[PDB]
Amino acid sequence: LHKEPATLIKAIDGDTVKLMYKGQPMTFRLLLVDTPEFNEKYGPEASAFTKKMAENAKKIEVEFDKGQRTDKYGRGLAYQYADGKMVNEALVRQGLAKVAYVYKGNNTHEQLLRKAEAQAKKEKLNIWS
Ligand SMILES: Cc1cn([C@H]2C[C@H](OP(=O)(O)O)[C@@H](COP(=O)(O)O)O2)c(=O)[nH]c1=O
Ligand SMILES: [Ca+2]
């Protein structure tokens, strides 16, 4: 897989963000994770985390997997990086997302994220407290 450029348009919540990709505004849904909705426990904390990571980044990138690049709602499906750090993985390591929605053929980073989830669960962080 490879990273491609994007720029931040606006934070949305823990697992969605509005980015400009190839010069067009699009909402992205982060692959392989599920954050609580804003109205649920840890939803606001997940939103704050990804808003900070994205807004402080000098360089945002997106990486598509091998499979579907948009979902049935027209959201782009990717892994998002902020100054080289994967947001998807960071959420999971902090106990602010569960590994979820693992569909065959868009699951390249599944085991990386499961290892983060195991470390978050060991530490009893956030969702795992
Ligand atoms: C992460 C992801 C979600 N989706 C669809 C499955 C879920 O359908 P339903 O809306 O029918 O539940 C929805 C979950 O996203 P949200 O967690 O953003 O609500 O998005 C995909 O199709 N592919 C994906 O990789
Ligand atoms: Ca969600």
Swiss-Prot record:
Query: Fragment boundaries within the full protein?
Result: 89 to 223 of 231
Q: Which residues cross the membrane?
A: none
What's the protein here called? Nuclease A
Enumerate the residue ranges of region (Disordered): 109-129
Name where it's found: Secreted
> Which residues does the Swiss-Prot or TrEMBL record annotate as the active site?
29, 37, 75
Query: Binding positions for Ca(2+)?
Result: 15, 34-35
From which domain of life does this come? Bacteria
Q: Where is the composition biased (Basic and acidic residues)?
A: 109-125
